[PDB]
Symmetry: D4
Subunit: 162 residues, 8 copies
């Protein structure tokens, strides 16, 4: 029941995107927690969350942020755990600011970045799953099955109907 | 004598750019400190630096950073003081990543952003000067002189 | 009652964005004026406004502009006061033209630039407030309280409900 | 003898680019003046330059500027004369900032914008020439000759 | 009655933007023609139009085009007359492809480029007017009056009402 | 012996890039002509070149151009033959202007666009080869050999 | 009746764009097949499709893909046939990711890339047609007629009505 | 001794960048293999490499690629193992094409993307280390030491 993955985002507005990561982890039966931590508004909350993540049993952290997106990066600065970042699409720059802010981490502090938006949130969950599967045979089996189904479920031709 | 402006940068590599902010402040005789504080590598140092800036007597903070530039923003998250950000030019993206990372702050935690590179470092110092000038008559006069000399020194025709 | 902050914009269309700066200054009880000054259509009005701002008692100027955004920059060319620039989102280029036009000031004439749009307008007001607070204990106290409330008001978890 | 075209730039650093506009005008024997006028550093000089351009007999103004490029635009705000803008290549953003700052003029105050760099400086001169040619038969003939030579001089195969 | 300005565009879809150039020329009483010439679909029509523009009495050509926008440029390759280009906003790239395609002319063949969209179309008309005014006192007077009115018509403050 | 592929470029400056298309065609022994045709400077030459390409026996046209790159597009406007465009890297915008100018052709007049630079020039030749291979068994075999050698030659580990 | 052109796309969502290629090939009477092959979800299906395309009689392959668009490129890595790529417009980046992912092929493995979206799909079909026409007199005649009609069908002036 | 991390790149030219991932893994004493696998030139080699990665004992794959960068993505399409992608800086577009090609993976097949260039190569190794550390106490301790040294080594002021 104890969470092994932590999904964090700066505000409620990010949930529309981050819910996809939540849904996928639940689908693959991966225990996790979902919280709001703002790098700009609650920097001390972030410091404490990231600093204690390992001892609390978390193995992976999935952080979503848009615009001047610091959440994934600053989180990674305080934890040795692998941190995955989801660029949340921004209004004006369509997530380009979100993407560059997260992916361009200088050497020494990594953040595995996923695609902008929903697809990135879902993939962050899947990447976290593939990480946990390395040492969890049962989960590895569920993931393999999930991937196999995805492949087998692709249609052979498009519905070309007018 | 006590510093009223704090100039901070992520690493030695930022100095080539941030040295321009240092030179300007010195030129206008504005007491300041110039330190290295990394948002990515020394987050606690940053937290402590920003938390105590006001208490220490600092009035403005000038922070330079490139790539996923967090220094100015995170610093502003821990202080009520005006934080000015300098986007340091990055190798690949020429500071576009630096600029977006710094300027696109969400409402509630501001960072007055300047141009990418040396021009931005110099302007951060000048902007800090114009801020300090609001309550320092002597400095205000020196800033007026600096701006006047800048304007008067522009040649009338190219060489 | 005398204004210490000047909020200027090129046209009525900018008000939708600049009203956020106005609202925040009023919220923090900072006396200010709100005017329309077009760098392209009323260059002499701009020259006079910027040139006399200091003697008129203004301490900070917040200027909004989009597209070929010259208002903040040209204003700064005529005043020694700190000028803050708000990139107003443009139709086609989503404020990227507005942003580069304002932030890329050459060495010698600064403009503290904020984010594109509403968030930038609000932050320009907050930055102006943090500047005025340096020499206004009462305002400093109001700002500190405002910042503290912002931090304390951040929810701990997202409303994950379907 | 009196100049009919005014070439202006923010600083000496723009000369490397704007010298191409000067060379072209000279080649076509178009009387012109080449000056330094900074929108940021010498705003009053700019205002005066633009306000009086028409009175002085100038027909077209070619203005070069980089980064937050305001020279062409602000000049057009003070004159009814055609203003052509040359985006000077900037260090970091390679003139993309220069280009957007100049070309994106709102309706009501135009600036005919040319390509970033030397090509743009040369074309501003040529565009000014084509404008002047509309009411100067002699120049029109010289422009026709220039364009004809350009076309005829292109090699048929690479070396 | 003979046209002195030629407004051309690649298709009917460009009219929504180019109509602003048409309206402004008419407003300033500048005789002009409005035609459709496609650089991609009617290259020979373009060659002939541009090649004969001068002898037909045209003094300025205003060409609008979007995407791989060649109309202004190719027109300029066939005429000695000044050619003004209007980048028509494109669906996906918002006119950025239109803008670069038109403004980046190599040294030797100029195109005075205006802003993306409606504002650019209107300004192309105004630029054409300022060119014609150089040798047409009456038009020069109308333009001066138009510019003066624009400046005088700018409001002093925004309608800040809720 | 008669050329079946025509390689064209706006000027000598494009040769550094387009020479790669020439080398590849020669390597695969594909008869071709390499000429300079400027869309901006020699529009009539271009019109004539494109109008008569088919009649002359050409099967594919490879056109290189940078900046406001019109060569490939305008050529395609005058011929029914497949036109492949190579975006030449531009000084300031690094070929982004070249790429958008070429690839964003409206429906009705296509241009098969390749990568910016030398890689694109080489691929245009290869793409032209794959087209010609559809009806030339000998060439098809040589292309298969070329592709096979490319694949087999890749090292297993870095030096 | 045997297909000489293969139109492939990663999912049903691409059909809205790829249908234009299908429609044009049918219009010019070019036999073709339309299938769904995902480079990400069905990599082995792609390998087999591309590898056997030539022996199956296919002469040209038109592949559409958006975002991290690998379909055209990977297809070209397995076939000697000419592969044409259609960048499918993406939500956030408007097809810019699609465009760069497809057009920037390294030297050695080409992909003739067309414009982003519908126009690109239609042009991929036309390019494929111009390729097939090189050795099919009847088709060459149909294409010539199609091109001639396009040119002749362009209106001479825009419907300037209010 | 058996490799637990596989570092792959499209060609020798990527080594200048990917060597940083190799150095980091060696520094942390993480058994790994460093190979050249081209998505464009050796697709079957890639398919085989990715299909069998898990069976061979590999835990994480680090793939570097530039331009139309497919290596990381296609590799992830054939393996259930975590795939980390390094955007190699491209000549013209400075790795922007590399970055978008790698990071914009559709839902269902992920690739943890790192920064463009050497910084990204180094971080991919570190990220792979943090993953491996989850089930390797010894390595976890070494990673903690590495991160601690990085933090403690940052100077307090610029030289």
């Amino acid at each position: 029941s104890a969470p092994v993955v932590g999904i964090i985002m700066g505000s409620q507005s990010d949930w529309e995107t981050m819910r996809h990561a939540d849904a996928l982890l639940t689908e693959l039966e991966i225990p996790h927690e979902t919280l709001i931590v703002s790098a700009h508004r609650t920097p001390d909350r972030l410091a404490d969350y990231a600093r204690t993540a390992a001892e609390r049993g978390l193995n992976v952290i999935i952080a979503g942020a848009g615009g001047a997106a610091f959440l994934p990066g600053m989180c990674a600065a305080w934890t040795r755990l692998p941190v995955l970042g989801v660029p949340v699409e921004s209004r004006a720059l369509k997530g380009m600011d979100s993407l560059l802010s997260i992916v361009q981490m200088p050497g020494g502090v990594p953040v595995g970045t996923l695609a902008i938006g929903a697809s990135g949130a879902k993939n962050a969950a899947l990447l976290a799953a593939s990480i946990l599967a390395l040492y969890n045979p049962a989960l590895a089996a569920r993931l393999e099955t999930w991937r196999a189904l995805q492949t087998a479920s692709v249609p052979n031709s498009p519905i070309t109907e007018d």
